[PDB]
Symmetry: D2
């Protein structure tokens, strides 16, 4: 599993459950193609988005739909979503964990890249 | 001044100087129009992006060009840029400060909305 | 002003107002002496804690009383306080800004050291 | 396992390996008693610090020795350590994951509390 997403809720101290995640890949003409999507689990994790075969070198965008998450909890947040844009596998195949820590007016994101 | 950006470097403990910043506004057909841009100052700040007259309600995107910043310092970073996408809402007079704290493989962003 | 503290609330998107802040300095026998304290202003800031004369090299602790802040807002928080422990070093004229971004179950802290 | 610690390095995009962690519990006379300690694994995790039986209600401090970590990498950081102080099990037995994201001049900490 080369690409995993983990989302945490800093208001409740819990995994952020059922958060929509969309992944896009930049295509040959400065257009962004849909690549994968899913919802985070009860542990705040999203696995199985892609395979090593399909996850080729390129520029990827991970969109985490934070506004819909906070609104479901009755909170009107600042951000529409959290976005993580990066080049993948430009130095060989890597495993990527994209983590996000969510608050209504702030988020932190971190990438753990392992070989 | 209704929209200010502040960028900090968590590796050097300093303002992030000469960072390119681009602001976009979502247009009537889900397309994004260039709105304002600049480079951060010696204090890590960018002021004077817009006026109260032009900064109307809408969806805005602030892109901070973090990869070029780290490459200038000799550090190999993860993200292409840091992105902050948000709705501006008239709920009384508001000033928006978008702050970002930068590390090579992580960033934190915060919005301070004051009257 | 060589030591300033800035505290922000990531739930409200605002300065954290009327937060108690305590500063300690490590003494010659691994004991911690009270050094300065105050409450953050309407801008989330605390200035005037010390002078250049008294702010000598040493180990310092900044305690931010986050639990009392969240309890005043009706939010059940995790931490008793946020703590920032650091060495001050003479390497040219330096000003220290200690910033903290607060959420109920998370905080981020940053030190900006400028000349 | 009711108390786990996870430490990440935001400069390298990796788990923070072999980081010393010390846990203290506040005792009856405003003194802090040593409770547990260890080093993070290759995954940046520290498990097995305590048992449900021994992890009683109280105020705990988790000290993460970040300065020694950065110095081993040749970096002189700002903080002596990252510190996380909290009340545990004051609402029944919980499982606590204390996570820290480390940069030379900034750190973020988050608690995931699960039942």
């Amino acid at each position: 599993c080369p690409l995993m997403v983990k989302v945490l809720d800093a208001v409740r101290g819990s995994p952020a459950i059922n958060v929509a995640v969309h992944v896009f890949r930049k295509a040959a003409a400065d257009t962004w193609e849909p690549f994968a999507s899913g919802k985070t689990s009860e542990s705040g994790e999203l696995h199985g988005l892609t395979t090593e075969e399909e996850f080729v070198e390129g520029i990827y965008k991970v969109e985490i739909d934070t506004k819909s998450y906070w609104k479901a909890l009755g909170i009107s947040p600042f951000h529409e979503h959290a976005e993580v844009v990066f080049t993948a596998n430009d130095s060989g195949p890597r495993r990527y964990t994209i983590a996000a820590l969510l608050s209504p007016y702030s988020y932190s994101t971190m990438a753990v890249v392992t070989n």
